[PDB]
Design a protein around this ligand. Structure first.
Ligand code: CA
Ligand code: CA
Ligand code: CA
Lengths: 74, 126, 155
């Protein structure tokens, strides 16, 4: 039903966002920089995850208020 | 319905307005305080979740393996981000729907011109 | 209401005297010395307007404070000032700041805390009257819709 479409959509979006790692020509110095680059990517993704978690909490508050307003005005 | 008493207040509407204005100011200060505190919290969360690289003393093959390890981690973190994003998206749909619902449930001449017409030259102050 | 009432409080005596002279034209010949839809309609038409009886009733209801169905001089002053704030999204964020236990309502304790934080000398009367001003449905707390009306026109 709805679950296998959500799952295939997730797989599809993550596949499209994935970058190719090609390191086979790099020397030691280039590899150290490549590692720093990947670390920064992880950092930025974690930062975005944190923003979304904070948004989620504000959204739960907003939804609770909306539900109360609806109940009180019915 | 029958007539009833007017609402009466111990304090002037002018006082209430001053208090409301100050109330909005301090709420706005608390909002800025919340944002600053959240920035601090974000810094600390990122210290834990994305700790610094230790590259000193890794040889060539170790560096190749580290790049592969980090790239794999990129995939995992993106998946976790996607999962929270999906919950945020569903909340947006719910917020939009409830906002419409509450909106539905909840669903001349100026004194200046009037004073000039009625009173003519006797209208000065107003 | 509140912002209009405050404007009325700040009218000069001579301004109020001129408004009284206008009020006297409206009420000329009225049984109870008050403006009904009959007197209001007569004057609006004299002024070149053509309101429907529904618009007339609505004009009265907007300022009628004792449910008399008529406008007395005090209600007339409010009508006059009305005839001459923040966004909802902005007020929604500010509401959350009052709502310290996150229950979707501003209670008396939360109002008190906020008022004290202003630095002004806060009397018990300040607190009780603001709550009564905000709480339209007499449950002793200010909900989101009440908060919007409560802060309407506040800078
Ligand atoms: Ca009345
Ligand atoms: Ca509360
Ligand atoms: Ca209430």
């Amino acid at each position: 039903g709805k679950r296998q479409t959500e799952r295939e959509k997730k797989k599809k979006i993550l596949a499209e966002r994935r970058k190719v790692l090609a390191i086979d020509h790099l020397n030691e110095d280039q590899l150290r920089e490549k590692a720093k680059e990947l670390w920064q990517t992880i950092y930025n993704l974690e930062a975005e995850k944190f923003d979304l978690q904070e948004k989620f909490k504000q959204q739960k508050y907003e939804i609770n208020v909306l539900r109360n307003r609806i109940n009180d005005n019915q | 319905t029958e007539p009833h008493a007017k609402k009466k207040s111990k304090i002037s509407a002018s006082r209430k307005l001053q208090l409301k204005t100050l109330l909005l100011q301090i709420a706005k200060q608390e909002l800025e305080r919340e944002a600053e505190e959240r920035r601090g919290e974000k810094g600390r969360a990122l210290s834990t979740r994305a700790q610094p690289l230790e590259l000193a003393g890794l040889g060539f093959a170790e560096l190749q393996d580290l790049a592969r390890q980090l790239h794999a981690r990129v995939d995992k973190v993106d998946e976790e981000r996607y999962d929270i994003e999906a919950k945020v998206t569903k909340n947006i749909t719910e917020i939009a729907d409830l906002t419409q619902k509450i909106f539905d449930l909840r669903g001349r001449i100026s004194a200046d011109a009037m004073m000039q017409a009625l009173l003519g030259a006797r209208a000065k102050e107003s | 209401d509140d912002i209009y009432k405050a404007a009325v409080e700040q009218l000069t005596e001579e301004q109020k005297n001129e408004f009284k002279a206008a009020f006297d034209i409206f009420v000329l010949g009225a049984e109870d010395g008050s403006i009904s839809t009959k007197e209001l309609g007569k004057v609006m038409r004299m002024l070149g307007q053509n309101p429907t009886p529904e618009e007339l009733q609505e004009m009265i209801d907007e300022v009628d404070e004792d449910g008399s169905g008529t406008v007395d001089f005090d209600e007339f002053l409010v009508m006059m000032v009305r005839s001459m704030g923040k966004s909802e999204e902005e007020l929604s964020d500010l509401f959350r700041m009052f709502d310290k236990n996150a229950d979707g309502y501003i209670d008396l304790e939360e109002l008190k805390i906020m008022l004290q934080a202003t630095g002004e000398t806060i009397t018990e009367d300040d607190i009780e009257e603001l709550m009564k001003d905000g709480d339209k449905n007499n449950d002793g707390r200010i909900d989101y819709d009440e908060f919007l009306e409560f802060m309407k026109g506040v800078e």
